[PDB]
Design a protein around this motif. Structure first.
Motif, PDB file in Angstrom:
ATOM      1  N   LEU A   1     -17.817 -65.302  96.232  1.00  0.00           N
ATOM      2  CA  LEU A   1     -18.766 -66.371  96.597  1.00  0.00           C
ATOM      3  C   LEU A   1     -19.328 -67.143  95.382  1.00  0.00           C
ATOM      4  O   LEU A   1     -19.747 -68.312  95.524  1.00  0.00           O
ATOM      5  CB  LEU A   1     -19.944 -65.818  97.441  1.00  0.00           C
TER       6      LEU A   1
ATOM      7  N   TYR B   1       9.746 -50.330  84.245  1.00  0.00           N
ATOM      8  CA  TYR B   1       9.956 -49.095  83.505  1.00  0.00           C
ATOM      9  C   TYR B   1       9.424 -49.197  82.087  1.00  0.00           C
ATOM     10  O   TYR B   1       9.058 -48.184  81.497  1.00  0.00           O
ATOM     11  CB  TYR B   1      11.438 -48.715  83.484  1.00  0.00           C
TER      12      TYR B   1
ATOM     13  N   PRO C   1       0.536 -47.050  82.679  1.00  0.00           N
ATOM     14  CA  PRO C   1       0.490 -47.255  84.139  1.00  0.00           C
ATOM     15  C   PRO C   1      -0.890 -47.532  84.726  1.00  0.00           C
ATOM     16  O   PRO C   1      -0.945 -48.136  85.794  1.00  0.00           O
ATOM     17  CB  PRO C   1       1.016 -45.932  84.699  1.00  0.00           C
ATOM     18  N   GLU C   2      -1.962 -47.101  84.056  1.00  0.00           N
ATOM     19  CA  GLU C   2      -3.340 -47.311  84.546  1.00  0.00           C
ATOM     20  C   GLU C   2      -3.704 -48.808  84.702  1.00  0.00           C
ATOM     21  O   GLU C   2      -4.403 -49.171  85.656  1.00  0.00           O
ATOM     22  CB  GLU C   2      -4.394 -46.563  83.691  1.00  0.00           C
ATOM     23  N   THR C   3      -3.233 -49.656  83.773  1.00  0.00           N
ATOM     24  CA  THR C   3      -3.341 -51.127  83.896  1.00  0.00           C
ATOM     25  C   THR C   3      -2.199 -51.672  84.760  1.00  0.00           C
ATOM     26  O   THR C   3      -2.328 -52.725  85.403  1.00  0.00           O
ATOM     27  CB  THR C   3      -3.300 -51.839  82.505  1.00  0.00           C
TER      28      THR C   3
ATOM     29  N   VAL D   1      17.181 -47.815  79.801  1.00  0.00           N
ATOM     30  CA  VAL D   1      17.623 -46.435  79.512  1.00  0.00           C
ATOM     31  C   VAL D   1      17.237 -45.989  78.091  1.00  0.00           C
ATOM     32  O   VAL D   1      16.885 -44.827  77.876  1.00  0.00           O
ATOM     33  CB  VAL D   1      19.167 -46.247  79.713  1.00  0.00           C
TER      34      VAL D   1
ATOM     35  N   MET E   1      13.226 -45.718  77.716  1.00  0.00           N
ATOM     36  CA  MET E   1      12.870 -44.532  78.505  1.00  0.00           C
ATOM     37  C   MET E   1      12.920 -43.217  77.706  1.00  0.00           C
ATOM     38  O   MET E   1      11.910 -42.499  77.628  1.00  0.00           O
ATOM     39  CB  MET E   1      13.807 -44.421  79.711  1.00  0.00           C
ATOM     40  N   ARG E   2      14.091 -42.928  77.112  1.00  0.00           N
ATOM     41  CA  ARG E   2      14.371 -41.661  76.409  1.00  0.00           C
ATOM     42  C   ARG E   2      13.605 -41.477  75.069  1.00  0.00           C
ATOM     43  O   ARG E   2      13.816 -40.496  74.351  1.00  0.00           O
ATOM     44  CB  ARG E   2      15.903 -41.466  76.218  1.00  0.00           C
TER      45      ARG E   2
ATOM     46  N   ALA F   1     -18.102 -69.406 100.685  1.00  0.00           N
ATOM     47  CA  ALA F   1     -18.096 -68.516 101.813  1.00  0.00           C
ATOM     48  C   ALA F   1     -16.901 -68.877 102.681  1.00  0.00           C
ATOM     49  O   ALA F   1     -16.142 -67.974 103.106  1.00  0.00           O
ATOM     50  CB  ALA F   1     -19.372 -68.673 102.568  1.00  0.00           C
ATOM     51  N   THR F   2     -16.721 -70.197 102.906  1.00  0.00           N
ATOM     52  CA  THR F   2     -15.715 -70.749 103.838  1.00  0.00           C
ATOM     53  C   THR F   2     -14.602 -71.497 103.126  1.00  0.00           C
ATOM     54  O   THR F   2     -14.613 -71.607 101.900  1.00  0.00           O
ATOM     55  CB  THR F   2     -16.367 -71.707 104.878  1.00  0.00           C
ATOM     56  N   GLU F   3     -13.647 -72.009 103.916  1.00  0.00           N
ATOM     57  CA  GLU F   3     -12.616 -72.949 103.442  1.00  0.00           C
ATOM     58  C   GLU F   3     -13.068 -74.446 103.419  1.00  0.00           C
ATOM     59  O   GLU F   3     -12.720 -75.178 102.474  1.00  0.00           O
ATOM     60  CB  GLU F   3     -11.322 -72.767 104.227  1.00  0.00           C
ATOM     61  N   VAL F   4     -13.837 -74.866 104.447  1.00  0.00           N
ATOM     62  CA  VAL F   4     -14.513 -76.181 104.519  1.00  0.00           C
ATOM     63  C   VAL F   4     -15.403 -76.382 103.301  1.00  0.00           C
ATOM     64  O   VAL F   4     -15.590 -77.519 102.855  1.00  0.00           O
ATOM     65  CB  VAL F   4     -15.383 -76.387 105.827  1.00  0.00           C
ATOM     66  N   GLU F   5     -15.927 -75.262 102.774  1.00  0.00           N
ATOM     67  CA  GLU F   5     -16.807 -75.214 101.595  1.00  0.00           C
ATOM     68  C   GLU F   5     -16.020 -75.239 100.256  1.00  0.00           C
ATOM     69  O   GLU F   5     -16.366 -76.006  99.328  1.00  0.00           O
ATOM     70  CB  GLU F   5     -17.683 -73.954 101.666  1.00  0.00           C
TER      71      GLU F   5
ATOM     72  N   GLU G   1     -14.614 -78.957  99.391  1.00  0.00           N
ATOM     73  CA  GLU G   1     -15.659 -79.817  98.842  1.00  0.00           C
ATOM     74  C   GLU G   1     -16.178 -79.298  97.472  1.00  0.00           C
ATOM     75  O   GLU G   1     -16.114 -80.049  96.489  1.00  0.00           O
ATOM     76  CB  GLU G   1     -16.758 -80.145  99.894  1.00  0.00           C
TER      77      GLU G   1
END
Ligand SMILES: Nc1ncnc2c1ncn2[C@@H]1O[C@H](COP(=O)(O)OP(=O)(O)O)[C@@H](O)[C@H]1O
Ligand SMILES: Nc1ncnc2c1ncn2[C@@H]1O[C@H](COP(=O)(O)OP(=O)(O)O)[C@@H](O)[C@H]1O
Ligand SMILES: Nc1ncnc2c1ncn2[C@@H]1O[C@H](COP(=O)(O)OP(=O)(O)O)[C@@H](O)[C@H]1O
Ligand SMILES: [Mg+2]
Ligand SMILES: [Mg+2]
Ligand SMILES: [Mg+2]
Lengths: 524, 524, 524
Positions: free
Chosen positions: A182, A202, A207-209, A263, A266-267, A383-387, A390
């Motif tokens: 909002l 890979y 992985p956390e981010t 590959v 990875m290793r 709040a809205t799409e009409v909002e 504009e």
């Protein structure tokens, strides 16, 4: 098709009804006491807007002649907007005003061609006058005030614009897009970053981010698709010996090559990542070159007759850290000396100077920012799409007016600047009496914006205009607080370039229009 | 097309009729004494519904202006619903309210842009007030009451929701679908299971269920189609030596491989079964990874450059039992330590946090449930199809409101919370008198839901509102038992997040709406 | 499209004309003094029918609102029929009755949601009451009586149905199809037979029938197309040594193989015949398995990795005789021990239990009959086509009602059961008075079917209902003989399941309908 031709006063009267229906839809929105218009849409929900050029593009009239009127003044509003993206209602209001008054003088038996000459003389004069009143807007506070005033008195927009302007610097881009919540929100990305994710999930060493991170990595810039891993080997191994990770920005990394890279990383062999090149077509190569420069590397394209295989460590770019997401790579702090950085920037400096287009201009300015300052994004909350629609539009709107203030200055709003330049040309004359009326016709219209601003508050335009006219310099009417004062002190600034364009464009068409004597169109 | 433009009181009157037709078809349904609306359909039988956003989406009007009205309020009802799946009629009712009163004040000659500022100020206030009245809803009893109240006083829905919520836990999905018989029924699937049958009905070692069952089986996870049996042999034989059965979940098992597997399991060689991977595209590999984790096995994909042949027993997942039907595989109790289970769950925890979409969110929450708690299905009973539709919708509807209760709390129904926050703001004021009327316009509308609730029982809104107004805290009117009392004790709880969203959305549009001064649209 | 919305008594009134035009077209057909309706057809000749759900599906009205009416009560008649293929007119009649009454009380100013609650409570209560009056219908005489009464008093239908039910046993199918002559005819095929003719008319060892006949023949079941004769040789010769004939049921027998088989049987080498497998797709293999079981043979499919060549005599099924026409194979008395027969039957027993479909249910029941009991066909006779249609439909109709009697029992017809459960609930009450009217609204409708039966005889419904109401148990009015008596003794039995579905479905939609307050639909 068979035509309906109409001549003189007859044709003009229809023409003006035309102007009037459009003008009147566009007026209701002028000023802080502006009101909104609703434009229907076969699409989905209607659109509520305060933005003059939006309303104006919708007006089309059934009477083919009324229509021609409306489709003409409609271009003042439209041009005003391509020029500074603000002041479109003002413009409209001025034209409705030049035309009203002008036609009435054509009915008095004046030669319209002279009415025109006088109107333009009046105007060329007013433009100089404006440039004379203009004072530079260059502190953050003023900038906030043009924002604010552009956004129908939304102090928050003012501030956000002012803030962004501040961080991305002078050569940074600011864009507006729909927000998640909002409240409005300002993102500023630091330095260089583009729209590309890892080519395989890979590579991700964090992985956390859900994102990749390498420190002191070499950067391999290949201006070509990468299918064979053979092309890499001499290089990948020179990097394995230096013990540093490696970014691969190529035109693309496909099955055979990628798979093997995947590959190998990875290793725990060699820390590597790969990501598509920025954009497509011709700019890719030029923009990949940007990346070269920033990190002090050498682009490896088969165009200069080069092979990946014949590339020592030296060709590779380098940085202190890189960060890549599902769809965003970013290089932090490149090794490139600011001698070469500053130089490549002084080149793309003149790319914009001879960019004979509008779209060939956007991209260059982007790149300049990714290499010099920063990129900023504003998110508009609703709040809205009409909002959203504009609100977004106003922030967009103000974004523009500030950029205009900065290059051309500010003058007193509430249409005081214009009312002032009108008294400065109280003595302008032309080559003949018709022309003198012509001049007077424009001076008078120059009172229009203040007069609508006031009428939109439901007070009396000619009382407010009289007392404003009775003062000096920047004394004006504060419509919002219903009191008089110094308009610059009160923070009611118009960007000079907009007040100016509204006058020019409106006069440029109104001028022509009042010299209609015949009109040709289709049969009902 | 040529347009019809309408200005000021004229345009608004029409706009209001448009709001009104819609708002009155939505009202009829408010509260326990609600009645239903019938919405026709070129399709097949009409639809009987009580659900406000359903009625609303049907209303389209023949006067293009009246229509504009209707198509605008229609979004409050729509948004309300995308937000909490409930309270859509309340929302509608509040907007019809804010508009009526607001336009009345524009005709008074107030400046509508201020009327709007007051209305919003009034509302930002009212939201805080609600967050203050909210109390957390977290026992099973309250949850049942929110469900119950949402399902038009259906205690059984309340109870089933409450019951499911309890078994699938906090990270478990609940879905509703058509039932076979007349009575509602709750299924809870224990642990992990997906939508895949055996690839040949020959695997079936228990024909009485028509389904496959293996105990202590190894699990082969292959992220690739399986055509050649050669790829299997080194593995199938390491399993024949350990004397345990084997599940094969690969991307697919086709002719050549399958046939032979089928021949091998048949002759009592090695107990095996095979079943397609869950889903398709990108999630398959990620979701197959889930299966790895749960059973402590290693995904074997040609993407990391792996071969089936080079897979010892160790790579295979394991569980205590598996159950597969014509179209449903299910793994019971995997060997994976809860160290690794809990971890992979803490990853898909943040998948949802950065799931920037609505569809990329559903699937992740599913998987979380298959790995953490449980999945639950409700089946709605009904004699007819006209009945199934309405009943299913209500269960769905309450399913939503309880999820809302749980994240945002409950307040007193019968529109008592709103009537109370109105007296808390009895002192709110804005920058100027118009804004003060603007504020009062909202506080006033805050009475609407209770006043409809009452009218829909065919007693006197202003008598009921007056005595509710005359009490305190959570005293309210019980429209079902026509007596006053404490609304929380009587179990008439609204989810806080719906009461709030109804207010927000309705104000958000009605606010804009009352500031129409022009309207453009097509010729009849 | 723009909509026409209608509110309270207004929308209801139109709704009810709607229900009425339909209800009335349906009524004319109720009971033994029923009359026929003619429904037109752009197709070819109109259709004369007595069948409530047939009339109903045709009704569609021009008034969009009246139409909604009609398209909604239309569902009682429709569901009624998918549920027990009978009672659809009674159903209709009760709904028109629950609606008429119900609405009249909404006009009294009762709360329709409660009208509804009481109408259901009333009904849940009535259903229990019916299960309590219900007595099993299990002799052939009663079965005839349900058939007969279902067939508008056609004693011959009653009998034929009763007769078939007797021969095909409890797990046998009975189907109705157009007959050749003027009189009805019952065929009963004994044991197992399917829709496949010889693959060459040369196999025919008895030209007088135009059909093939073999005694003590071995049966080769091949789940695969047969092109090469090589695949046969090891087998054909093991059979030539045992000196018995051979049936070949494969997926198909094409050119090369067939031709040679044809040449071999011709010259008096080995007595053989061949015929396609039953059905296609997946059931073929399962159904060919049936044939295996019945004759104690082993299916030879390349799926379990099997070759025709490696098949000794032992794999072959066997029977005492087989009979094959242009399009009909039949196996008489298979060698399969009833240990294995009964078992395979106990499997396809639960195939139907978990057949979650309607079409996946038909086939299984078929197979059960071909393996357990017998298959029966009724042929309806008629002079004309207008006649065949209506008669055939009635037989169909009664076929259903008997199947329903048998599973759920019988109650007294002529609407007596319902009139009796109505006095049993004379004391039912709900939570409040409105609900009490709502109860009373249903108990009253429960008189509807007896009241129409009577009115269709052109006597006075409320004299008949009075006297029937004055009696006990199964006292009722014989409309055909215009005298009172015990309805069970007079053989006027309604299958309980239908009398109960009529009530359920009619109340289920009537219930909703009387809670209409708004109705939305298209402009005329
Ligand atoms: N408080 C104020 N008093 C008088 N004029 C104001 C005030 N605030 C903004 N304005 C003026 O409003 C005018 C235009 O606003 P706007 O309605 O967007 O017209 P446009 O579309 O022509 O930009 C500017 O002249 C600005 O000076
Ligand atoms: N016994 C009752 N007395 C007064 N209000 C009730 C009662 N039961 C439910 N309600 C109120 O019903 C209102 C909403 O029901 P509903 O008709 O679904 O409107 P919505 O679609 O706006 O959710 C809630 O405010 C709830 O408090
Ligand atoms: N001689 C009879 N006297 C009274 N009712 C009869 C007699 N014969 C049949 N009925 C009744 O006819 C009613 C229904 O016949 P039918 O017209 O097909 O209605 P439906 O389509 O509702 O089955 C049953 O209630 C049955 O009891
Ligand atoms: Mg502006
Ligand atoms: Mg609700
Ligand atoms: Mg019948």
């Amino acid at each position: 098709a068979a035509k309906d031709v109409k001549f003189g006063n007859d044709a003009r009267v229809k023409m003006l009804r035309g102007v009037n229906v459009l003008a009147d839809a566009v007026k209701v929105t002028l000023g802080p006491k502006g009101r909104n218009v609703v434009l229907d849409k076969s699409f989905g929900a209607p659109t509520i807007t305060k933005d003059g050029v939006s309303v104006a593009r919708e007006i089309e009239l059934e009477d083919k002649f009324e229509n021609m009127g409306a489709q003409m003044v409609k271009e003042v509003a439209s041009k005003a907007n391509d020029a500074a993206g603000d002041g479109t209602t003002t413009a409209t209001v001025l034209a409705q005003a030049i035309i009203t008054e002008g036609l009435k003088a054509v009915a008095a038996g004046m030669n319209p061609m002279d009415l025109k000459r006088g109107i333009d003389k009046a105007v060329t004069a007013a433009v100089e006058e404006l440039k004379a009143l203009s004072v530079p807007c260059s502190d953050s506070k003023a900038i906030a005030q043009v924002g604010t005033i552009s956004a129908n008195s939304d102090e928050t927009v003012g501030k956000l614009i002012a803030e962004a302007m501040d961080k991305v610097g002078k050569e940074g881009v600011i864009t507006v897009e729909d927000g998640t919540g909002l409240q409005d929100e300002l993102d500023v990305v630091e330095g260089m970053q583009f729209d590309r994710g890892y080519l395989s999930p890979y590579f991700i060493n964090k992985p956390e981010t859900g994102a990749v991170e390498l420190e002191s990595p070499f950067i391999l810039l290949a201006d070509k698709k990468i299918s064979n891993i053979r092309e890499m080997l001499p290089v990948l191994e020179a990097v394995a010996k230096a013990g540093k990770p490696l970014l691969i920005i190529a035109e693309d990394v496909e099955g055979e090559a990628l798979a093997t890279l995947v590959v190998n990383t990875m290793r725990g062999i060699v820390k590597v990542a790969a990501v598509k090149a920025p954009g497509f077509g011709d700019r890719r190569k030029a923009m990949l070159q940007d990346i070269a420069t920033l990190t002090g590397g050498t682009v490896i394209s088969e165009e200069i007759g080069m092979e990946l295989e014949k590339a020592t460590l030296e060709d590779l770019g380098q940085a202190k850290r890189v960060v890549i997401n599902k769809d965003t790579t970013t290089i932090i702090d490149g090794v490139g000396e600011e001698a070469a950085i500053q130089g490549r920037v002084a080149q793309i400096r003149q790319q914009i100077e001879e960019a004979t287009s509008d779209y060939d201009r956007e991209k260059l300015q982007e790149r300049v920012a990714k290499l010099a300052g920063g990129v900023a994004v504003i998110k508009v909350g609703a709040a809205t799409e009409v909002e959203m629609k504009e609100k977004k539009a106003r922030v967009e709107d103000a974004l523009h007016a500030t950029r205009a203030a900065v290059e051309e200055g500010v003058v007193a709003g509430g249409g005081v600047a214009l009312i002032r330049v009108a008294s400065k040309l109280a003595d302008l004359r032309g080559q003949n009496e018709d022309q003198n009326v012509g001049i007077k016709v424009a001076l008078r219209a120059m009172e229009a914006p203040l007069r609508q601003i006031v009428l939109n508050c439901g007070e009396e335009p000619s009382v407010v205009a009289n007392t404003v006219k009775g003062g000096d310099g920047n004394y004006g009417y504060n419509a919002a607080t219903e009191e008089y004062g110094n308009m610059i002190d009160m923070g009611i600034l118009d960007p000079t370039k907009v007040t100016r364009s509204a006058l020019q464009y409106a006069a440029s068409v109104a001028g022509l229009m009042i010299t209609t004597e015949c009109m040709v169109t289709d049969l009902p």
